[PDB]
């Protein structure tokens, strides 16, 4: 246990099929979405119903393809208000053997279903209600199913971590101190990474259990270095999603990544795609102009294209193993 180890609290990762030892996690994708729906998708149920058999077939096919790559674990980062379905994730996991951790949390103000908790906040202690929800889902289970969330998902807006969002950050810090559960986050358009790390650590959350995400959204490495100073991990977790409404290209992501790797930050860098295996609501109508922005946007892209490109650029087998196996084992295990 060299380096920065988690402050003895959580002893094993909690997956949708039960507890799993850190050493059993293996190569892991720290931020993906088996299924996902933007708030409102359920309102379009008549014309956009969930085809369970089709979704299970497509998702198990993806899980099998990941296992072929030696990826044994996926962290599903889907917020409670964005189509999270623990029971479905368990079906996919039981069917294939792929380990899946699910999340507890609400999305950022710009895209989440915010009305409910904004209302609860106007009436009383919304932070405490959110804390109770997170704590119960992490320690006891979700929706009475016994399936527990293995990570807390937090998300902030671009210009600030809004009052609405801070309710979740404060509740999550409290649950993190009590259980030691991992925290993963969404940052909007390459902003607030430092602010998130400062806020969570100042609230007492363990930096060794924190992964600030969507950091590939910023192409100035000083921003990543400022975030990393807090002792937290950062994830380039939308690899393959290029030029989509402002995101950098993978070439730009790799430049920052290789610069950080050359500066010895391998112990704090994680890689994922933020892929969606099966969309909820009506199947997305992909515009002909956006086809290139999503061509590498699937979960086999890091295994097949990114890792070999890092290796040929001088990144070592040990560094790749640290990012894809070592880091996840410590952060989620």
Q: Which residues bind Co ion (CB under 5 A)?
A: 77, 186, 274
Q: How many residues bind Br ion (CB under 5 A)?
A: 11
Task: Give a three-class secondary structure readout of 119-183.
Answer: HHHHHCCHHHHHHHHHHHHHHCCCCCCCCCCCEEEEECCCCCCCHHHHHHHHHHHHHHHHHCCCE
Q: Which does 274 bind (CB under 5 to 8 A by kind): Co ion, Br ion, none?
A: Co ion
- The residue among 89 and 315 lying less far from Co ion, judged by its C-beta, is 89
Q: Give the shortest CB-31-to-Co ion separation in angstroms.
A: 6
Q: Give the shortest CB-329-to-Br ion separation in angstroms.
A: 17
Q: Is 44 annotated as contributing to ligand binding?
A: no
Q: Give the shortest CB-6-to-Co ion separation in angstroms.
A: 23
121 CB-contact burial (10 Å; exposed 0-12 / middle 13-18 / buried 19+) = middle
As given in the structure block, the two tokens for residue 191 are 């902003």
Q: Which does 186 bind (CB under 5 to 8 A by kind): Br ion, Co ion, none?
A: Co ion
Does residue number 279 form part of the binding site for Br ion (CB under 5 A)? no
Q: Is 274 annotated as contributing to ligand binding?
A: yes
Q: Which does 153 bind (CB under 5 to 8 A by kind): Br ion, Co ion, none?
A: none
Phi and psi torsions of 33, nearest 5°: -135, 110
* Distance, CA of 108 to CA of 165 (rounded, Å): 6
> How far from chain centre, in Å, is Cα 324?
14
CA distance from start to end of the chain: 13
- The residue among 145 and 259 lying less far from Br ion, judged by its C-beta, is 145
Does residue number 121 form part of the binding site for Br ion (CB under 5 A)? yes
* Distance, CA of 300 to CA of 307 (rounded, Å): 11
- Judged by CB under 5 A, which of 42, 87, 160, 286 binds Br ion? 87
Binding positions for Zn(2+): 31, 33, 153, 186, 214, 274
């Amino acid at each position: 246990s060299s380096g920065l180890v988690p402050r003895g609290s959580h002893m094993t990762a909690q997956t949708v099929t039960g507890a799993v030892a850190a050493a059993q996690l293996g190569a892991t994708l720290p931020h993906e979405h088996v299924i996902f729906g933007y708030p409102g998708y359920a309102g379009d149920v008549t014309l956009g119903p969930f085809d369970h058999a089709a979704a299970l077939a497509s998702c198990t096919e993806t899980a099998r393809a990941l296992l072929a790559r030696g990826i044994q674990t996926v962290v599903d980062a889907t917020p409670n208000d964005c189509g999270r379905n623990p029971a479905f994730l368990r079906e996919v996991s039981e069917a294939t053997g792929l380990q899946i951790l699910c999340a507890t949390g609400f999305y950022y103000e710009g895209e989440g279903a915010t009305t409910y908790f904004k209302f609860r906040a106007s009436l009383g202690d919304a932070e405490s209600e959110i804390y109770e929800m997170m704590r119960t889902e992490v320690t006891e289970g979700i929706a009475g199913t016994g399936i527990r969330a293995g990570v807390i998902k937090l998300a902030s807006s671009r210009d600030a971590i809004t009052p609405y969002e801070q309710l979740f950050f404060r509740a999550a810090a409290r649950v993190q101190r009590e259980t030691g559960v991992p925290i993963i986050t969404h940052t909007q358009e390459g902003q607030q990474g430092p602010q998130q790390a400062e806020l969570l650590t100042s609230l007492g959350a363990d930096p060794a259990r924190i992964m600030i995400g969507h950091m590939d959204g910023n192409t100035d490495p000083a921003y990543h270095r400022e975030t990393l100073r807090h002792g937290v991990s950062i994830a380039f977790d939308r690899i393959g999603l290029q030029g989509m409404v402002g995101t950098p290209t993978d070439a730009e992501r790799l430049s920052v990544l290789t610069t950080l790797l050359g500066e010895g930050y391998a112990d704090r860098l994680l890689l994922s795609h933020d892929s969606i295996w099966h969309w909820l609501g009506r199947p997305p109508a992909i515009p002909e102009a956006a086809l290139p922005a999503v061509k590498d946007w699937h979960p086999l892209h890091i295994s097949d294209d990114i890792l070999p490109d890092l290796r040929r650029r001088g990144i070592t087998e040990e560094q790749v193993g640290q990012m894809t196996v070592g880091n996840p084992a410590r952060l989620f295990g």
